[PDB]
């Protein structure tokens with residue numbers, strides 16, 4: 076977090092911090108049909124907008 | 125020989141002078157065994173008698189190529205299906221003149237049908253380079269849930285893939301819904317400053333209606349629409365500074381036959397050198413089996429590219445649709461229409477007249493914006509991120 | 512009321528259909544079916560519209576079952592126009608109204624009994640998973656609608672637990688002028704043992720004229736084609752190489768009187784539940800003339816009520832595209848001569864295959880026994896059907912069971928398999944272990960080779976004089 080404050084004041088950021096919903100870092104796998112290979116956790120959250 | 129070839133054309137006067145258009149083609153052709161004749165019938169702008177007013181006089185006349193016309197009602201697409209279905213079984217070609225939808229382009233049905241005018245979906249091809257010349261990397265796409273709209277979004281997304289673009293965001297609009305302001309405002313969260321639209325007459329008005337209270341007409345926005353949105357029942361609430369496209373000479377059905385009769389008349393010239401040149405059996409009742417020479421007749425059609433007539437340079441091939449189409453770039457200003465460019469088929473040719481944008485800004489806003497507020501993500505880890 | 516006027520064009524026995532007409536034991540609900548038995552040669556479109564014009568105008572007739580024995584694909588397209596203009600549901604069971612179709616207008620309540628191209632794509636991916644042919648090539652020709660089935664291929668492979676060895680996709684042109692010679696040029700860049708081909712029945716002979724020219728079709732290659740290419744078992748183009756296998760729409764167990772009984776019952780009972788709740792029978796303008804004035808009697812709500820169809824213990828739900836999504840698919844293979852025989856069965860996404868492994872260096876039987884350090888066997892993985900990558904398949908006698916063999920000794924066999932080409936089907940020993948001579952007979956792995964049933968045995972075998980007299984041991988590679 077100390078690193079993020081350094082980047083904030085050098086290229087005009089405005090941030091807000093919220094942790095991940097579950098806890099897992101991220102992994103691609105299929106759920107409930109063996110044919111839905113997709114990310115999860117933080118890695119899934121980034122690609123979801 | 126007297127070959128009765130015509131069409132079910134509306135605008136009786138238009139088919140009246142078409143009776144002498146063949147005479148012009150009669151002199152040009154040097155063929156001897158064939159003396160094509162015009163036996164047309166009046167249009168039927170209703171579904172009552174199409175059970176008995178399609179082949180009852182055309183196939184019995186031993187037709188080879190059938191043109192088409194348009195009814196006075198602008199919202200109509202049932203006209204070319206009953207004629208196409210009969211020609212689809214017999215494999216005898218038919219020619220589309222006023223045909224404009226993308227339904228008669230997939231060729232999955234109506235195996236024998238030729239088009240002299242590109243369908244409305246083809247406007248997306250020229251649209252691909254339209255913003256690329258003026259930078260505008262980011263766009264927002266929103267179309268009505270229509271088959272033509274489905275084709276336009278399918279072709280463009282298969283056209284912008286060469287630029288390694290992901291089309292930013294795509295929105296879907298279902299025809300017949302009015303309270304759609306909630307859907308519209310979701311696009312405001314995007315950084316893209318390019319707005320495109322391809323909808324119907326009823327959808328164009330309500331979309332423009334929702335663009336008033338939300339100050340889309342304000343400065344910093346660009347709008348691109350098809351020719352179906354500049355004209356018709358959409359100028360009541362049309363936002364200013366629209367860079368919509370426009371078709372040229374496509375409505376001149378009087379000049380339609382000038383290029384229509386040239387290709388077919390000279391097509392038989394190459395055909396009168398092979399075998400199996402036999403007319404289909406007479407009538408529409410006594411013939412229950414198709415003659416062997418079916419789609420072989422078409423095989424001589426796309427090979428004919430004659431640059432003659434009022435428009436000229438017609439090169440129908442591939443999908444049975446015209447190549448190197450011509451459209452005029454149009455800009456709407458203070459409820460007035462002024463040309464600002466023209467697309468000859470390959471590249472864009474603008475006009476000296478100043479191009480305007482909504483809000484009166486002479487400068488062209490960049491089709492992009494930046495957000496200074498970001499949302500970060502972190503995970504509980506001991507030495508790095510205490511919680 | 513409701514009338515079911517059937518139409519039969521061709522040579523068929525419509526006399527028994529009268530008994531089938533008087534067999535709707537649906538007195539529980541007000542079906543009131545006035546089934547009509549109409550059958551005449553009316554192939555021309557003028558006859559069709561005129562005949563139905565007097566037919567559907569008799570009295571409130573709202574049902575037609577289409578039966579035909581002709582392969583004219585253009586009849587179905589004409590059928591859609593009548594349904595689009597009118598509001599009477601129409602169904603076909605055989606003939607010129609049983610093949611696929613892209614899409615129709617919302618006002619066309621026409622459905623048939625036959626799966627479409629996207630249904631075929633899933634069908635043969637499942638049976639080939641049983642035989643584990645992970646490497647395959649996709650070849651298709653230009654066709655009005657040749658894009659949907661190939662599109663489904665990419666959807667399945669990406670979200671797959673088991674890796675898929677896609678040997679590229681070929682999009683050669685068959686109807687292109689001056690392209691016949693180019694077919695051979697594009698036919699010299701295929702190496703996958705399995706190739707999937709899509710063509711047309713009329714052009715199948717034309718396509719196979721060049722396919723047989725290169726001649727990679729004798730024994731080591733398998734061709735896969737849709738049911739549309741074959742058409743019928745009796746009707747064969749006769750140029751297909753021996754060993755061709757394809758899926759088919761069931762017709763042997765689905766006879767014309769049998770396939771006509773299902774359609775008539777559903778149509779009458781489809782709107783029966785409508786009267787149960789809304790207490791209204793949908794009766795639009797039953798007039799041949801003034802079809803435009805009939806646009807006020809909309810029946811789209813009734814169209815959406817036909818989704819739930821259940822009869823004879825099977826559901827026959829239909830979608831917007833006019834699909835059945837419950838097809839009985841029977842696989843057919845080419846015999847030594849031109850003949851197609853049943854290969855498997857389909858029952859609620861279940862595939863049963865008569866044999867165990869594909870019959871007939873280049874293939875050599877192998878006999879192997881489990882032993883701790885070299886060959887270890889285990890049961891197959893139930894999650895993904897197969898065991899795992901790097902794990903060679905291993906049949907075990909008794910019937911048979913999909914066992915799986917792995918270890919260190921079997922790794923050697925893989926290395927030499929690519930060195931000198933040969934296929935195999937490893938199977939375990941039945942009587943005895945490692946071979947013993949009793950009453951002048953050999954058992955074990957050494958007993959299979961001496962009795963001419965193995966031709967090769969691998970595992971943990973120790974060389975000695977007695978065994979070296981019967982078989983010819985190779986150079987040893989491990990001290991013992």
Ligand SMILES: *[C@@H]1O[C@H](CO)[C@@H](O)[C@H](O)[C@H]1NC(C)=O
Nearest residue numbers: 083084085086087088089496
């Ligand atoms: C951040 O923005 C402010 C005003 O918006 C101004 O100081 C400058 O543009 C930026 N500060 C920097 C780059 O240090």
